[PDB]
């Protein structure tokens, strides 16, 4: 329901998620950093009025490093609070065809998001290595958000393996209409507790946020190796220490070639879908 | 000949070269598509 | 040796167009001798 | 200079085996079963 | 192959046939000779 993890063969998520392994190591890296309020810096003059949608080709023209086409301001309609949606989720400011548009709270939530997302290069944010120090706490000790204490290395196994395929299947894959309620539930004024209890109890976008905090890792790391048990079509491919021996985004030329302000994109995505989590600001 | 082989046949190396020229012509060739249109009646038409 | 590695022309590079001059390759395998033409000598040295 | 430096890498991909892409390495080695490392040498190179 | 030809020599003879082949099974391998004299060559210039 979430979307079929393909690779030529069907899947839920679900098989997908409890594929993997996440076993720890030693030298514990007593190192506990500190969340931040993720730095919204909105501002432009100019935007780009219309129909913009904001389902699948926003989140693949966002997050999955196809054309670097400057991909710019186009979000800068998420101020302006009188702007509305439809449900196909394209953002407007003139619904045509007597089309309806979304009640309140939704459409605060999800400005309130994509508000965060505008303008990244103007956006001051913080270095990697703490955003991977909150991504391996979060996969790792659950919702409870404790410090790590040690490190963590990450092991997939079995898939005739594509993980190209993994961030292509990202790339056909919707969200808004997932975690609307979520940020919804941020918007009025709610506490860590109960959106913990929330998150706990849907289970939907738990399993959602887990695979793309997992590929925004896997995307920016670089200790990284693949191989193919060449006997099946099967690859097991390993991500070793994935927080100490990380500052700058990758170059390696056999992974996945990852360019720079994408990159940025995708650290602000996992700051900003983090946040409400954690404690005060 | 862009890949010398000792063999007088119609070996691998000719599956190899063929492979060689297609690949750099589909690095070249960029073309845009651009086409103009008719109008017809739907009504007066079987297929949906 | 210096002579040799410098201004060598082999047999089997030329064969499979590897230090050929001005064109490669020519397909034909190195030779090396038949049978006959070393029975009548070898023979010929032993009953000397 | 992006020319030549294309013209190097494309050419660079069909020899030199110890060189993937990040994905399919697969037809590669449906591709370069042509060339028969380590045959090929300079001669070959510059006719590339 | 020669002491079943009724050819003379002694008993158990040998030799040191100094080069190795290169087609083992059909792979024309890396031709280990010039692996040898390769790091001859290039520890004696880290040696100059």
């Given at each position: 329901m979430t979307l079929t993890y393909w690779d030529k063969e069907k899947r839920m998520t679900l098989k997908q998620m409890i594929q993997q392994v996440a076993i720890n190591e030693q030298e514990n890296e007593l190192t506990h950093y500190v969340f931040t309020t993720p730095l919204s810096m909105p501002t432009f003059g100019k935007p780009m009025l219309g129909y913009v949608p904001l389902n699948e080709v926003a989140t693949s023209k966002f997050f999955s490093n196809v054309n670097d086409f400057d991909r710019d301001n186009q979000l800068a309609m998420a101020h302006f609070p009188d702007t509305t949606i439809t449900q196909a989720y394209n953002l407007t400011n003139s619904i045509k065809p007597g089309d309806t548009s979304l009640p309140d709270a939704e459409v605060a939530a999800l400005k309130w998001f994509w508000k965060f997302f505008t303008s990244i290069n103007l956006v001051r944010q913080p270095p990697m290595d703490n955003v991977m120090y909150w991504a391996c706490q979060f996969l790792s000790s659950g919702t409870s958000f404790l410090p790590l204490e040690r490190d963590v290395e990450i092991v997939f196994s079995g898939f005739k393996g594509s993980h190209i395929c993994m961030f292509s299947n990202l790339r056909q894959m919707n969200l808004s209409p997932i975690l609307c309620p979520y940020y919804d539930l941020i918007t009025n004024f709610k506490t860590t507790t109960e959106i913990r209890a929330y998150v706990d109890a849907h289970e939907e976008l738990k399993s959602l946020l887990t695979y793309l905090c997992l590929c925004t890792i896997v995307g920016l790391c670089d200790t990284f190796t693949e191989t193919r048990n060449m006997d099946t079509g099967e690859y097991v491919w390993k991500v070793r220490d994935?927080?100490?021996?990380?500052?700058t985004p990758a170059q390696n030329v056999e992974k996945f070639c990852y360019t720079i302000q994408n990159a940025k994109y995708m650290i602000q995505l996992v700051h900003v879908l983090l946040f409400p989590l954690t404690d005060n600001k | 000949n862009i890949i010398n082989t000792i063999?007088?046949?119609?070996?691998?190396a000719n599956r190899t070269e063929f492979f060689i020229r297609v690949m750099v012509l589909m690095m070249m060739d960029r073309k845009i598509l651009t086409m103009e249109f008719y109008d017809v009646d739907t009504s007066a038409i079987s297929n949906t | 040796v210096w002579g040799l590695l410098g201004n060598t022309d082999s047999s089997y590079g030329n064969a499979i167009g590897?230090?050929?001059?001005?064109?490669?390759?020519?397909?034909v395998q190195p030779v090396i001798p038949t049978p006959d033409n070393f029975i009548t000598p070898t023979i010929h040295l032993k009953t000397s | 200079i992006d020319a030549i430096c294309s013209v190097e890498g494309i050419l660079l991909l069909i020899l030199s085996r110890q060189t993937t892409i990040p994905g399919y390495e697969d037809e590669l080695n449906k591709l370069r079963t042509g060339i028969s490392q380590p045959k090929v040498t300079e001669r070959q190179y510059r006719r590339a | 192959r020669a002491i079943a030809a009724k050819f003379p020599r002694f008993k158990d003879s040998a030799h040191l046939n100094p080069y190795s082949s290169l087609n083992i099974g059909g792979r024309t391998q890396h031709s280990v000779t010039y692996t040898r004299m390769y790091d001859a060559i290039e520890e004696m210039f880290n040696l100059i």
């Open positions: 994935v927080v100490s021996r990380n500052h | 063999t007088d046949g119609i070996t691998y | 590897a230090t050929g001059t001005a064109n490669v390759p020519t397909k | - | -």
